[PDB]
């Protein structure tokens, strides 16, 4: 029930909230301190995952390890390209509780 | 033979062919047990020990059985 819920909430973040797709943009948004949630495919390289987690600890933002992979995370985002890292700036749908 | 070897009582364990084959004991069970009783031997517990499969291999005879 958790995977279907996160898929539906991620779909509703698209088309209704500000996000950003990809690694470089995610790091940029984190160090600007405006990324409120970071979602990682389990396909992510372990060094990249660890570095993003350290960045998230520094910026005090949440990290969700997606139970898919970059292909499936791309599909869940509604895109036709693989996304391995993404950041939600504001949900608009209570994916991130106040 | 049991009496000349000093045995006075007998537990009984009736067995049929069992397995995938028949479960009814043969005609000799009743007479054997009655002869043991009437010969002075004492009788203790009685129990059926027929081999009952939880489920068995295919029984012989073909699907059309033993045509007689």
């Amino acid at each position: 029930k958790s995977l279907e819920s996160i898929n539906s909430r991620l779909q509703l973040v698209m088309k209704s909230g500000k996000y950003v797709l990809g690694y470089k943009q995610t790091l940029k948004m984190i160090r600007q301190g405006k990324a409120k949630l970071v979602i990682l495919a389990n396909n992510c390289p372990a060094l990249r995952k660890s570095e993003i987690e350290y960045y998230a600890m520094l910026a005090k933002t949440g990290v969700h390890h997606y139970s898919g992979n970059n292909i499936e995370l791309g599909t869940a985002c509604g895109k036709y390209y693989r996304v391995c890292t993404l950041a939600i700036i504001d949900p608009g749908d209570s994916d991130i509780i106040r | 033979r049991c009496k000349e070897l000093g045995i006075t009582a007998l537990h009984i364990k009736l067995r049929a062919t069992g397995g995938n084959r028949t479960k009814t004991p043969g005609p000799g069970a009743q007479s054997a047990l009655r002869a043991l009783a009437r010969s002075g031997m004492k009788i203790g517990r009685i129990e059926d020990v027929t081999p009952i499969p939880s489920d068995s291999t295919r029984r012989k005879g073909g699907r059309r059985g033993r045509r007689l």
Binding site: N43, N69, N70, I71, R82, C84 | -
Partner: protein, 91 residues
């Protein structure tokens, strides 16, 4: 247009070696030369280098696999059994 009715990839062998042998080698050659989706980078670039050796052009990850397929069903069942026995071994 469609160029062959049924031989497909074994049309290179011509009329030689027998119909059943060509049919047998057709699926193995298709699996041999197919490009598989890499399970590390997600790109469909994992292809065979030598017999049993599968390399990805993107992340340069080399994996030991089957002779003709990226992984054999035997090895997959083996990995599942090893995982089960490991999680049974500890508590």
């Amino acid at each position: 247009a469609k160029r062959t009715k049924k031989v497909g990839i074994v049309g290179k062998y011509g009329t030689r070696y027998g119909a059943s042998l060509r049919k047998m080698v057709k699926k193995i050659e298709i699996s041999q030369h197919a490009k598989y989706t890499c399970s590390f980078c997600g790109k469909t670039k994992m292809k065979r280098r030598a017999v049993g050796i599968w390399h990805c052009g993107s992340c340069m990850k080399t994996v030991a696999g089957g002779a003709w397929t990226y992984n054999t069903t035997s090895a997959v069942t083996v990995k599942s059994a090893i995982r089960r026995l490991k999680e049974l071994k500890d508590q």
